[PDB]
Structures are given as C-alpha cells and as structure tokens.
Amino acid sequence: KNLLLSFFPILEWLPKYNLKEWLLGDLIAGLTVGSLQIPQGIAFALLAGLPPIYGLYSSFFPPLIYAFFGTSRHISVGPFAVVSLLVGSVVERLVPDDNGTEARDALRVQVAFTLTFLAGIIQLALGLLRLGFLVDFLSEPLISGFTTGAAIHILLSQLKYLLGLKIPRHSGPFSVIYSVISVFHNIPNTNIATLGVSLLSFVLLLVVKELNKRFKKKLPVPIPAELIVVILATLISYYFNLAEKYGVSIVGHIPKGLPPPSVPDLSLFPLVIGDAIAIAIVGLAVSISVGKTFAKKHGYQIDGNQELIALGLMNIVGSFFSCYPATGSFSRSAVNESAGGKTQVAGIVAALVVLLVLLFLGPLFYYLPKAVLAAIIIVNLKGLLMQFKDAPKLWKVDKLDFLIWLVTFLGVVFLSVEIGLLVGVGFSLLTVLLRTQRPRTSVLGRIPGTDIYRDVKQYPEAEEVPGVKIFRIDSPIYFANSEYFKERLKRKTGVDPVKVLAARKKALKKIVDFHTLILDFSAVSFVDTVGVKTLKEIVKEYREIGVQVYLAGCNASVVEKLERGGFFDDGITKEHLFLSVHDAVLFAQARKALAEQ
Amino acid sequence: KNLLLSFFPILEWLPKYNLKEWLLGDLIAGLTVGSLQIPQGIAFALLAGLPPIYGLYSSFFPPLIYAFFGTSRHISVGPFAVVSLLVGSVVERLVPDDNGTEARDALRVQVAFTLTFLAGIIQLALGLLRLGFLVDFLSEPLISGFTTGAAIHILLSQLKYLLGLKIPRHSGPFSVIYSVISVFHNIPNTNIATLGVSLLSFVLLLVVKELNKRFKKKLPVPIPAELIVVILATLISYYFNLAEKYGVSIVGHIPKGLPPPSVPDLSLFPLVIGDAIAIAIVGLAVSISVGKTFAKKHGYQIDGNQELIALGLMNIVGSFFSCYPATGSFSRSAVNESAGGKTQVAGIVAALVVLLVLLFLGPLFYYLPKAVLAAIIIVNLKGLLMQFKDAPKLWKVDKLDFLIWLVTFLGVVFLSVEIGLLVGVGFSLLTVLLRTQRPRTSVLGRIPGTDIYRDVKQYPEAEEVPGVKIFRIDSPIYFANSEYFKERLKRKTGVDPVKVLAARKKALKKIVDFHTLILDFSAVSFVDTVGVKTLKEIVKEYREIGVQVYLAGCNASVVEKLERGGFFDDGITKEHLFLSVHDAVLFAQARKALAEQ
Ligand SMILES: CCCCCCCC/C=C/CCCCCCCC(=O)O[C@H](COC(=O)CCCCCCCCCCCCCCC)COP(=O)([O-])OCC[N+](C)(C)C
Ligand SMILES: CCCCCCCC/C=C/CCCCCCCC(=O)O[C@H](COC(=O)CCCCCCCCCCCCCCC)COP(=O)([O-])OCC[N+](C)(C)C
Ligand SMILES: CCCCCCCC/C=C/CCCCCCCC(=O)O[C@H](COC(=O)CCCCCCCCCCCCCCC)COP(=O)([O-])OCC[N+](C)(C)C
Ligand SMILES: CCCCCCCC/C=C/CCCCCCCC(=O)O[C@H](COC(=O)CCCCCCCCCCCCCCC)COP(=O)([O-])OCC[N+](C)(C)C
Ligand SMILES: CC(C)CCC[C@@H](C)[C@H]1CC[C@H]2[C@@H]3CC=C4C[C@@H](O)CC[C@]4(C)[C@H]3CC[C@]12C
Ligand SMILES: CC(C)CCC[C@@H](C)[C@H]1CC[C@H]2[C@@H]3CC=C4C[C@@H](O)CC[C@]4(C)[C@H]3CC[C@]12C
Ligand SMILES: CC(C)CCC[C@@H](C)[C@H]1CC[C@H]2[C@@H]3CC=C4C[C@@H](O)CC[C@]4(C)[C@H]3CC[C@]12C
Ligand SMILES: CC(C)CCC[C@@H](C)[C@H]1CC[C@H]2[C@@H]3CC=C4C[C@@H](O)CC[C@]4(C)[C@H]3CC[C@]12C
Structure with missing residues (x-):
C-alpha cells in the first residue's frame, strides 16, 4: 500500500x-x-x-x-x-x-x-x-556555533599526530586549554620525520x-x-x-x-x-x-x-x-x-x-x-x-541570534561538547521569551476623517475619542509578560483602578477621564492560564470604578480560552467582544448617549 | 539623608x-x-x-x-x-x-x-x-504546591517522635515512601507511654x-x-x-x-x-x-x-x-x-x-x-x-496553573525538597511559552458601513476588501512562535509566495487574489531577533510575487527594533507603516487606482 x-x-x-x-x-x-x-x-x-x-x-x-x-x-x-x-x-x-x-x-x-x-x-x-x-x-x-566549536577541538587533537608528540589529553571542562599548553610544553619532543x-x-x-x-x-x-x-x-x-x-x-x-x-x-x-x-x-x-x-x-x-x-x-x-x-x-x-x-x-x-x-x-x-x-x-x-564568518553577520542584524552563536561556541570550546550543545539549546529557547517579555503597548486614537486608530505617540495626527480609552498590546499575554501588561495598562491609561477605589471609599466614609476601556486584542496570538487570570483581574478592577471593558479584536482560540477559563461571568459578556476597534468605539459612544437619556 | x-x-x-x-x-x-x-x-x-x-x-x-x-x-x-x-x-x-x-x-x-x-x-x-x-x-x-509538599514531609518526620519509634530515615529521592514503610514495619516497637x-x-x-x-x-x-x-x-x-x-x-x-x-x-x-x-x-x-x-x-x-x-x-x-x-x-x-x-x-x-x-x-x-x-x-x-483546597480551584479556572501546583507538590513529596522547588520553578516559566507558542491568527474584514475590521470567521458580517488581504497575529513574534506565524500566514491567506514564484518561473522558462498584504501588528507586544528575521523573509517573498506588505499597528519599540534589525531596506520603507488597518487599507486602494491610470 x-x-x-x-x-x-x-x-x-x-x-x-x-x-x-x-x-x-x-x-x-x-x-x-x-x-x-x-x-x-x-x-x-x-x-x-x-x-x-x-x-x-x-x-x-x-x-x-x-x-x-x-x-x-x-x-x-x-x-x-x-x-x-x-x-x-x-x-x-x-x-x-x-x-x-x-x-x-x-x-x-x-x-x-x-x-x-x-x-x-x-x-x-x-x-x-x-x-x-x-x-x-x-x-x-x-x-553553526556548535560545529565551529567542535572543529576547534578536532584541529587541536590532530596537532599531536601531525608533529609526532605523545601527549595524553581530555575532553572535560576547560580541556582545550590544558591540551594546547600540553602541546606547547612537548614541542621540543617533536619527531622531525613526522x-x-x-x-x-x-x-x-x-x-x-x-x-x-x-x-x-x-x-x-x-x-x-x-x-x-x-x-x-x-x-x-x-x-x-x-x-x-x-x-x-x-x-x-x-x-x-x-x-x-x-x-x-x-x-x-x-x-x-x-x-x-x-x-x-x-x-x-x-x-x-x-x-x-x-x-x-x-x-x-x-x-x-x-x-x-x-x-x-x-x-x-x-x-x-x-x-x-x-x-x-x-x-x-x-x-x-x-x-x-x-x-x-x-x-x-x-x-x-x-x-x-x-x-x-x-x-x-x-x-x-x-x-x-x-x-x-x-x-x-x-x-x-x-x-x-557568521558571527559578524548575525552581529549586524540580530544580537540575540549572535548570542546563540557565541554561547554555543564558547560552551563547546571552553567546556564539554555535550554541555556546549545543551547550554546553546537552552539559551536558544530562552531568546523567544526575552523577545516577548516586554512587548510594545500603545494607546490608540482615531486618525481624523478616517475610521482607523493608531498609536498617538508615533502618529501625532491621531486624536483620542472622548470618554473612550483604547489600549493595544502587541504580544501574547502569557506568564512571561502578564504583570508587565497590567503595569503598562495602569501607566499609559493614567488610572490605577484599585487606588481610585481606595480614594473613593476613604472620601465616602469621611463624609478618571473615561467610561470605557477598549482593549484591542488583534495582536494577542494566544493567552495562557496566567493570561486569563490577569485579564480577569483587569476587568474586575475596572468594573469596580465603573468602567466597561470591551475587547475588540480577539481571534477564535483566545475567545474559547477566555471562555473555558471563566472570563465571561464576572462582569463581561460575550456581547462586549467586537470585531474591530471602530465597532467597539461606536457601541461605546452609543451606550453613553442612550444612558444620558 | x-x-x-x-x-x-x-x-x-x-x-x-x-x-x-x-x-x-x-x-x-x-x-x-x-x-x-x-x-x-x-x-x-x-x-x-x-x-x-x-x-x-x-x-x-x-x-x-x-x-x-x-x-x-x-x-x-x-x-x-x-x-x-x-x-x-x-x-x-x-x-x-x-x-x-x-x-x-x-x-x-x-x-x-x-x-x-x-x-x-x-x-x-x-x-x-x-x-x-x-x-x-x-x-x-x-x-502553594511547595509548602503543601513540605508539610507532608514534616508530618511524616514527627510520626516517629509521636509514637516513640527509633527509625532512621532520609530526605533523598523517593525518601517519603521508604520512610512511611519504615514506620509501618516498626509500629510494633511503639512506646505506649509516649x-x-x-x-x-x-x-x-x-x-x-x-x-x-x-x-x-x-x-x-x-x-x-x-x-x-x-x-x-x-x-x-x-x-x-x-x-x-x-x-x-x-x-x-x-x-x-x-x-x-x-x-x-x-x-x-x-x-x-x-x-x-x-x-x-x-x-x-x-x-x-x-x-x-x-x-x-x-x-x-x-x-x-x-x-x-x-x-x-x-x-x-x-x-x-x-x-x-x-x-x-x-x-x-x-x-x-x-x-x-x-x-x-x-x-x-x-x-x-x-x-x-x-x-x-x-x-x-x-x-x-x-x-x-x-x-x-x-x-x-x-x-x-x-x-x-487550591488544587481543585486552579483545576476549574486554569489547567496550566493547576499543573504548576501539581508538578511542584509531587516534585517535593516524591523527590527532594530542593529539587521540587527547582522543577516547579522551571515548569512555571515554561507555561508562559506554552501560552504564547500557538497564538491566535485571523484574517480580518471590514464590518459593512463601519471603518472597523474584525475576524471574518467569528463575525460573519465582515467582508474582505477587494485586492487587500489583512492578517492579524495576537501575540509577540519571537523564537517560540515565529515558524508558526509564517505557516499560518501562508495557510489563512491561501498563498505560498515561494511556490507561486516557482510556478511562475517554470511557466516562463517553458514558454493570487491580492496586491497588498496588511499585517495588523496591534497585538505584537514585542519582536525579538528571530522575529525580525521572520518578518524580513515574509516581506522579501511577497515582494518577489509582487505584493506590497504594509504594517498597520506597530508600537514604538517594535518599529525601533525592526529598524535596528535592518527591516527597512529590503523593499519596505517606513512610509508603509500606518496607524490603523483602515489607514493602510485606504492607502492600498488609492495606490492601486492611481496605478490603473
Ligand atoms: C544531570 C543532567 C540532566 C539533563 C536533563 C536536561 C533537562 C531536560 C530538558 C527538557 C526539555 C523537555 C523535556 C520534557 C519532556 C516531557 C515529556 C512529555 O510530554 O510527556 C508527558 C508525560 O510524561 C511524563 O510523565 C514525563 C515525566 C518526565 C519528563 C522526561 C523528559 C526527558 C528527560 C529525563 C532525563 C533523565 C535523566 C536520567 C539520569 C541522569 C506526556 O507526553 P505527551 O506526548 O505530551 O502526551 C500527550 C500526547 N500528545 C498528543 C501531545 C502527543
Ligand atoms: C529571587 C529568586 C531567584 C534568584 C535570582 C537569580 C538571578 C538571575 C539574574 C537575572 C538577570 C536579570 C537582568 C536583566 C535585566 C533586563 C534589562 C536589559 O538587559 O535591558 C537592556 C540593558 O541590559 C543590557 O543589554 C546589558 C548587557 C551587558 C552585560 C554583559 C556585558 C559583559 C561583556 C563581557 C563579559 C565577560 C565577563 C566574563 C566572566 C567570567 C536594555 O536593552 P535595550 O537596548 O533597551 O533594548 C532591548 C530590549 N529591552 C531590554 C528594552 C526589552
Ligand atoms: C547540578 C545542578 C545545577 C543547577 C543550575 C540550575 C540552572 C540555572 C538557572 C537559570 C536561571 C538564570 C541564570 C543565569 C543568570 C545570568 C546572569 C547575568 O545576567 O549575568 C551577565 C553576565 O554574567 C555572566 O557571564 C554569567 C555566566 C553564567 C551565569 C550564572 C548563573 C547562576 C547559576 C550558576 C550555577 C553554578 C553551579 C556551581 C556548581 C554546581 C551580566 O549580568 P546583567 O546584570 O544582565 O548585566 C547587564 C546589566 N543590567 C543593566 C541588566 C543589570
Ligand atoms: C529532536 C531533538 C530533541 C529531543 C526530543 C525531546 C522530546 C520532548 C518532548 C516534547 C513533547 C511535545 C508534545 C506536545 C504537543 C503539543 C500539543 C498539545 O499538547 O495539544 C493538546 C493535546 O495534548 C494534550 O493536552 C494531552 C495531555 C495529556 C498527556 C498526559 C496524560 C497522562 C495522565 C497521567 C500520567 C501518569 C504517568 C506516570 C509515568 C511515570 C491540545 O490542547 P487543546 O485542548 O487543543 O488546547 C490547548 C492549546 N493548544 C494545544 C491548541 C495550543
Ligand atoms: C576545499 C579545499 C580545496 C580547501 C583548500 C585546502 C588547502 C589548499 C588549504 C586551505 C584550507 C587550509 C587549512 C584551513 C585551516 C587551517 C587552520 C589554521 O589554524 C592553520 C592553517 C590551516 C591548517 C589551513 C592550511 C592550508 C589549507 C589546508
Ligand atoms: C574570537 C571569537 C570569540 C569570535 C567572536 C568574534 C566577535 C566578538 C567579533 C568578530 C568580528 C566582529 C565584528 C567585525 C566588524 C564589525 C563592523 C563594525 O562597524 C561594528 C562591529 C563589528 C560588527 C564587529 C562586532 C564583533 C565581532 C562580531
Ligand atoms: C488553628 C487550630 C485551632 C486548628 C485546630 C487544631 C486541632 C483542634 C485539630 C485541627 C487541626 C488538626 C490536625 C490537622 C492535620 C492532621 C493530619 C492528618 O493526616 C491527621 C489528623 C491531623 C493530625 C489533625 C489532628 C487534629 C487537629 C490538631
Ligand atoms: C492527591 C493529590 C495528588 C492532589 C491532586 C488532586 C487532583 C488530581 C483532584 C483533587 C480534587 C479534584 C477535583 C474535585 C472536583 C471536581 C469537580 C468536577 O465537576 C470536575 C472535576 C474536579 C474539578 C476535580 C479535578 C481533579 C482534582 C483537582
């Protein structure tokens, strides 16, 4: 068959x-x-x-x-x-x-x-x-790093047979070093015919x-x-x-x-x-x-x-x-x-x-x-x-790809060839986390006379909508970057909802710019478990100071995970999921008007 | 001071x-x-x-x-x-x-x-x-896992002093097991006054x-x-x-x-x-x-x-x-x-x-x-x-947070208390990568009569724009998820630009729906080194089959990294960076019209 x-x-x-x-x-x-x-x-x-x-x-x-x-x-x-x-x-x-x-x-x-x-x-x-x-x-x-390192060892090994010395050596930690000095000591014992x-x-x-x-x-x-x-x-x-x-x-x-x-x-x-x-x-x-x-x-x-x-x-x-x-x-x-x-x-x-x-x-x-x-x-x-030739090329373009090369190569020359490979591979995996761990958060505004929204720092043209604060993270929200997200949300929206609730309660027992935060989740590739917990927290805190949180962007899998993780009962309904930031903005403004009367 | x-x-x-x-x-x-x-x-x-x-x-x-x-x-x-x-x-x-x-x-x-x-x-x-x-x-x-595990050890230790046995024991691999059986063997040697x-x-x-x-x-x-x-x-x-x-x-x-x-x-x-x-x-x-x-x-x-x-x-x-x-x-x-x-x-x-x-x-x-x-x-x-009580709670909400709890607890009971902590912590870190490694990619269309764009599967209302294919990843693009991104881009846009170039060249030596891909980078929190290389590749391949790639969304830091990494010479200019998907869509359509005449 x-x-x-x-x-x-x-x-x-x-x-x-x-x-x-x-x-x-x-x-x-x-x-x-x-x-x-x-x-x-x-x-x-x-x-x-x-x-x-x-x-x-x-x-x-x-x-x-x-x-x-x-x-x-x-x-x-x-x-x-x-x-x-x-x-x-x-x-x-x-x-x-x-x-x-x-x-x-x-x-x-x-x-x-x-x-x-x-x-x-x-x-x-x-x-x-x-x-x-x-x-x-x-x-x-x-x-590249690993094979270049391994060719340094293979070159040093074949010096002894090439001259005619009878040096013993090892492949253990720092073995290249004492192997080369071993050959420098025994160079007077050189066979000349060899x-x-x-x-x-x-x-x-x-x-x-x-x-x-x-x-x-x-x-x-x-x-x-x-x-x-x-x-x-x-x-x-x-x-x-x-x-x-x-x-x-x-x-x-x-x-x-x-x-x-x-x-x-x-x-x-x-x-x-x-x-x-x-x-x-x-x-x-x-x-x-x-x-x-x-x-x-x-x-x-x-x-x-x-x-x-x-x-x-x-x-x-x-x-x-x-x-x-x-x-x-x-x-x-x-x-x-x-x-x-x-x-x-x-x-x-x-x-x-x-x-x-x-x-x-x-x-x-x-x-x-x-x-x-x-x-x-x-x-x-x-x-x-x-x-x-590849260490300068990588250096120019990506410095984390140049570190994968160097860590692996140094690990192979100046420790073991097994351990070099292991450390290299670990570093390689960690570089993906280092890329995604301080992602690029933004507050978005509407380009005038267009129904597109882009960063207000990078596009000074764009104006914020009255009553509606729109924020956009450009990463997954997972264990590596989720505390960061919640920090940057409270810093770029300029409001900490728990501090605001504390001040409100203190003032009420002695006696914010916006009504709607729209999170644009277009670039949230995935959410993991810590992610869903962090988004639960944000929504609950901003419910408490009386701010609706709408999501505008979410892919299918992120909505299914939020749903399994229990995100859709603590204030948020699946009707606060919109397609694009614009559709959420319209809905936000409209609710505000219909409630003014 | x-x-x-x-x-x-x-x-x-x-x-x-x-x-x-x-x-x-x-x-x-x-x-x-x-x-x-x-x-x-x-x-x-x-x-x-x-x-x-x-x-x-x-x-x-x-x-x-x-x-x-x-x-x-x-x-x-x-x-x-x-x-x-x-x-x-x-x-x-x-x-x-x-x-x-x-x-x-x-x-x-x-x-x-x-x-x-x-x-x-x-x-x-x-x-x-x-x-x-x-x-x-x-x-x-x-x-929680680690302290609950450690309290199992501390309970088993104090059984011997509580009965009056004179058992020796260890804290090494699988030590709880032979410690409990040690106490079951020596229970006839119980002091009664103790x-x-x-x-x-x-x-x-x-x-x-x-x-x-x-x-x-x-x-x-x-x-x-x-x-x-x-x-x-x-x-x-x-x-x-x-x-x-x-x-x-x-x-x-x-x-x-x-x-x-x-x-x-x-x-x-x-x-x-x-x-x-x-x-x-x-x-x-x-x-x-x-x-x-x-x-x-x-x-x-x-x-x-x-x-x-x-x-x-x-x-x-x-x-x-x-x-x-x-x-x-x-x-x-x-x-x-x-x-x-x-x-x-x-x-x-x-x-x-x-x-x-x-x-x-x-x-x-x-x-x-x-x-x-x-x-x-x-x-x-x-x-x-x-x-x-915390293992069922975690179970309900997030299953990766319940695994952190179980791995650490089992690691502490049924191996060492040091090793339990180490394995637990490693697993904890890895869960962020597992959250971000198969992110939620989407193809976006315009909601009719609104200038917002959302997923066309999840919002059947939304229609694709003629000539313009808009795609949105909802994650960082880093080492963990970057091959995935490029796969899903070629699968959800329905075009592989290298296969298309091969077919074109084969047909020309024997003798696609769109003219513009807009990547919405609103949720790309960060890009790392592998990320910038992967985006270089995508843009170069789609330049070769004659498709302009515009980015619409990028936060400040992602644009600076793309620039250092050398993304802005191989076809793409910084004038193909737009604020919102809409502004890119308009520009795309306009270029197409002005080139028709
Ligand atoms: C001192 C130097 C040490 C170097 C270590 C380096 C660091 C390690 C690097 C780590 C990289 C990742 C390794 C973890 C693999 C997980 C396996 C997995 O998925 O199995 C799961 C459960 O299986 C288990 O219960 C796994 C329990 C332990 C995992 C053993 C890994 C091998 C190392 C052991 C070393 C032994 C050392 C011997 C003595 C020295 C189930 O598999 P699955 O397929 O996911 O099931 C679902 C099915 N589909 C559909 C998904 C398919
Ligand atoms: C508590 C329980 C746990 C126990 C604790 C465990 C402890 C674990 C420890 C963990 C360490 C954590 C610290 C890292 C902080 C992150 C910030 C960061 O790096 O941002 C950068 C600054 O940093 C650098 O880039 C500096 C690098 C230079 C250092 C090496 C030079 C030596 C040359 C030869 C040495 C030879 C010596 C040989 C000796 C044998 C800024 O970067 P940027 O340009 O802004 O853009 C990048 C993107 N970001 C950062 C903005 C996102
Ligand atoms: C068998 C079991 C083993 C268990 C291991 C578990 C696995 C390990 C877990 C790993 C978690 C992360 C550990 C790596 C820490 C990196 C340090 C760092 O940033 O330094 C950098 C260079 O410094 C170096 O050159 C570092 C070289 C090696 C790193 C040593 C780490 C400790 C473990 C050793 C174990 C020894 C074992 C002894 C014998 C057994 C510079 O620091 P920096 O601050 O980033 O500089 C820039 C400045 N700012 C602005 C960012 C501040
Ligand atoms: C080449 C060089 C390197 C060397 C190789 C190194 C090898 C390293 C190996 C690495 C392993 C890699 C395999 C993982 C594949 C990922 C797919 C995945 O998991 O998706 C899931 C299926 O998988 C599961 O969830 C199944 C889990 C059950 C298994 C354990 C049950 C046992 C209970 C008791 C056992 C007790 C036994 C005791 C024994 C002592 C699908 O999930 P989902 O619902 O679709 O949504 C989740 C999100 N995603 C996945 C969609 C994104
Ligand atoms: C593919 C073939 C033709 C390459 C050419 C081989 C001959 C002519 C040349 C080029 C490659 C050369 C070797 C490459 C590597 C080294 C290591 C260095 O530390 C000393 C010189 C030494 C040992 C060179 C000696 C001369 C050499 C053997
Ligand atoms: C000797 C072993 C450790 C190999 C390590 C070599 C590294 C550290 C060296 C080798 C060649 C070097 C590069 C050579 C040329 C240039 C061009 C210059 O405009 C900027 C620095 C840059 C890009 C260097 C960066 C550091 C570099 C990549
Ligand atoms: C905070 C205080 C008041 C809690 C109450 C203490 C007394 C009254 C009770 C409740 C806590 C109890 C212990 C909690 C844990 C265990 C482990 C279990 O495998 C056997 C019973 C045993 C050993 C219990 C014995 C009785 C106990 C000591
Ligand atoms: C004994 C040691 C290993 C602790 C591990 C206990 C784990 C595997 C057990 C303890 C209690 C269990 C939970 C008890 C109750 C329920 C409610 C039911 O509707 C679905 C399963 C669920 C949520 C169980 C999942 C598995 C669970 C969390």
Missing part, C-alpha cells in the same frame, strides 16, 4: 529512474565520493579511537541502508568529523589507554557498537512518534586541489586528492622505511573481508546513554539541515519524520555489522552534487567502491603514516572553520 | 508612633506571639536537628534586627516549619547521627551557622543589586483552641494553648517521672544565659552553598508574600528590595549570635494581627518575652517529652495542609 511505499521510498523512486541522462552522472558521482570516503573513512576512525577498518565499514553499510529508507536525493551519509569526535570522547573515557592492545580494542569496539545502537534507537523512536517537528527548534546559529611527512602531505593536497580547481577540465571525473596523497605517502613510507628507522607512527594492520555480525552489549547502557543522546541529536540536526538545503535548491521536499526513521535504521543495522554512528555531511553532499549526483544510486555506487577496497586492497595501507591522515582531517575542516 | 532613613526604616516610623491608641494593642500582640514563639521555637529547633536552645535564640535576635531594617508592619519573623525542614536535611546529611553527642552537636551547629550566613548574604545581595523584582516570578501556585503523652497533648491543644475560639472573651489576651500544654506536660513528666521509668524521650538540658558570639566556618562553603540558595529563595518567597498580603489588606506598601536587605541582615547578624535562618510566616503574622499588632513594636515585645525565658526560665523544660513538641508541630501544620 501507500504506507509500505512511503515507509520504503526506494520501491517508489527506483522504477521511475530514467537510465539515459542520469546513470552516467550518478556513476561519476559515486566514484568521486568513494575516492573521498576511503581516506576520510580511515581518518575519522582514528579521530574516534577505534581501529582503522571501522571507517571503511562505516562508509559501506550506512549509505546502502539510507538509499533504501531515505527521502533525500543529494545527501551522502557516512563518517563525518563532529560525530567521530563525540564517539571518540566516550570510547577513551570508558576505555582508558592503559594481548593488551587487542583486549583494549575489543572493549573499545563494544563501546562503539552500544553508542551506534542507542543513537539509532533514539532517532528511530523520534521518527515513529512523529516528533520530527522538534528538529526545527535547532536554530541555524545554534548549529613533521616532514605532514608538510609533504599538505603540499600535495593543496597542489592537487588548486590544480584540478583552476586548470582545464580534460576529465569526466575530478582528480581525487586525498586518495593520491594517501597512495604516494604509503609508498614513500614503505620504500624509505619511515616506520622502523625514523620512528614515524603508522596505521596498523587493516584486515581483509566483510564485517563480522556483532551484538552491542547493553551492559554499558547506563554509562553511555547520555552521549548516545548527544550523538543522536547532532546527527539529526546536521543530516536534516543538509537534506533541506539541497531539497530547497533543487525544488523538492524531504519528510523530517521519514528522515529520522531512515537515519535510525541505518545506525541500528550498522550497529550489528560493526559500524559507528553515521550522519550526512555538507562536504560529501556538495562533492556528490557537483560531480552530478541525481539520486541515491550515487550512494550505492560509492559503497561498492569502499566494498572492493575492504575486500581486496585492504592491508596495502599498512605503511600509511598517521600524519597523512591528520593532514587530511585538517584540510577537510576548512568547511566548518569558515563559519566564523 | 533620605537614603539613611530609607536604609533604616526605624528612624522614620518610630518618632511618629502615637502612644495612646497603639501601645496597648502592640503589647497585647507581643505577649500573644511570645507565648507562641517559645514552644514552637524549641519544636522547630528539633525538626532542624539542632539542640533545643537554638529555637529560643532564633526567636529572639531575628525579630529585633528586622524591626530595625524592615518595611512590613504585620510580619513576624522567626523559626517557621519549612525552612527548619531544609536546615535539618543539610545538618543530618553533613553530620550523620553516629563526648560523642557534644562533638556531633558542635559540628552540627557549625553547619547551621554556615547556612544562616550564606542565606543572609544571598538575600542581602539580591536586595542591594535591586533584583527584588525576581520575587514576582515565584507564582502563588508554585508556592503515645499516651502524645494523645494527651493533642487533646489539651484542641480543647484550649476550641474553648478560647467559641467561648466568651472575658480576656484582653487570648489563652496561650501551646504554652500551657508544654507546661502541664513537663510537670506531668517530672512528677510521674516518665523519662527514666517508662523510657519516654525528653528534651535535654536548656542552658541559661544570652547567646555566645560565634563564627560560621566557611570551610564547609562548597558542601552547603546549594541548600543555602534554596533556604534563601524559600525565605524571600514566603516572607514577601506575607508582607504583601497584610500590606494590601491594611492599605500600605512594602519595598521588595528593602525587604531583601532586612531579611539578609537579620540572618547574617543571627549567624554570628548563634541562630538558624529565620523568615516570616503567615501563622505568627495572623496571630500578631488578630491580637492587634500595629507596628514592629510587637516584634520587639515578643523578643523580650523569649529573652526573659532564655535567661531565667530556661532548664525547667528538662522534663518536656519530645512527643508534646511533635504534637505542637502537627497542630501548626493545619495551615499548610489546608492548601490542598
């Missing part, structure tokens, strides 16, 4: 695939992105603490399962920097670095699989419960990227920079024999064959559930952003709920077949699009490229120096570091 | 004190409230873990120092149940129950003094920084309270119930010798003489700063509520800032002279008023009554059974338990 085809998009979009103007483009794109996934795969695997094959596994399985369940047409899923950073934190925290290496690595990969499992389950859940609207609450400033192969690597990378960018096409497929750098460097470190002589650290044994089916031991569930929640939220945020970017630009739509289901299935399947959490990324996605990716056929093609390297090529990457992997990670990190 | 007289209110209100119609009333009230403070003082001291004299000290010093710095005229400050509960938690947590007794008691009273100190400093601070407006954010449902003196005590208390309530005045001063019950019971337990024979636990030695000046050792500052923050916030909340209640009822005003300074000075002085945190309370305050309290002279008088009992009477309360103290605490707790 339509349910089965919507819960497995492949069965809808694959039959309609036109093999003539697309298949060429998707195969080019697949080869381009596979050439990119192999080096980065292994890189991002080291950054995460796991052995190097996990990057090849994470680059093979995820993109397939997403091709099946996925709605986006330009996203490439796989191992991406920030998630790898988060997985790494948890691994090295639950398995410190202290036969021995294989024992530690076995426990490491078990922690990884638990993280992948839980992160997939959370994402799957959210998508089944149709809570995919909550990925809108993750502002773009929030996510700095050699690092700088050689960067030179070849920038040369090939600039060359294939500026120089002539003469190619259906672009020049794969990272691949050829890994290849030249592994050959150089095998011939000149860097590993054993000069002491340059190399990638270990990469085992041949398909992944082994494994089981995430949920014995570690209470240790890792917190960081699995952070992985899951980061993954959704980044992947769905990218989905939406390319969907907007190419004139189609993604479903946020089906996207959550797809990413969750991909992680859970992967958890079973020896992977770590994948996600989409704007880099691979841009590369996949610029190469001429049209469907998820490109994802399937790229995964077959990683498959043939898992199976055959395999242990030729024995003599690959870890410095060439660190250099690849630093040149990929350009993307996220160029987002510092 | 006026500063010195406002920073020491006594120097203003004391000279003007008329000695003829007031001094009698205040002396009656002072004696009534002192008769109440002695038994309760000692009671609340046991409830807090400290030795019994601390209640007499806390009943003597605080009321004096508040008389000097205080603005309220009917509040009585002193030891009150809920704060004593909180101090007790911290004491027995930092000093578990395991020569030995004096050593433990010395460390106990040191913890107490640190709490009093810090709580006074926090309250003093808040009042100097003029942050006394933040005590408005503490809803009445919040505080249950005797408990039930005797309650009988005498209810008899004397009912008697002096219903029966004839024949008295300038009411009958002090708690005092005469403590007196009869101590004499009974001395004559019949309950302590040694039948094993009834008694109050220890009450030492004679004034307090010793002490120093709160801030060596414990990092252990107790969290609970000192809870003490401080509870104290302010309760004391200032009461201040405001009696100020409203008697036709004067308190300053919230001067109240914070007064309560903080009182706690800091007291911390030095061997006290534990005091606060106002509605019970003593009601007793002080009903007796005929007119000024803080009543507080000074009551403190002299406690002074003469500290000095002289003193160790006659050796043979006082602790069961008579527990019974006094249970009959005083009536006050706070009758607030369960």
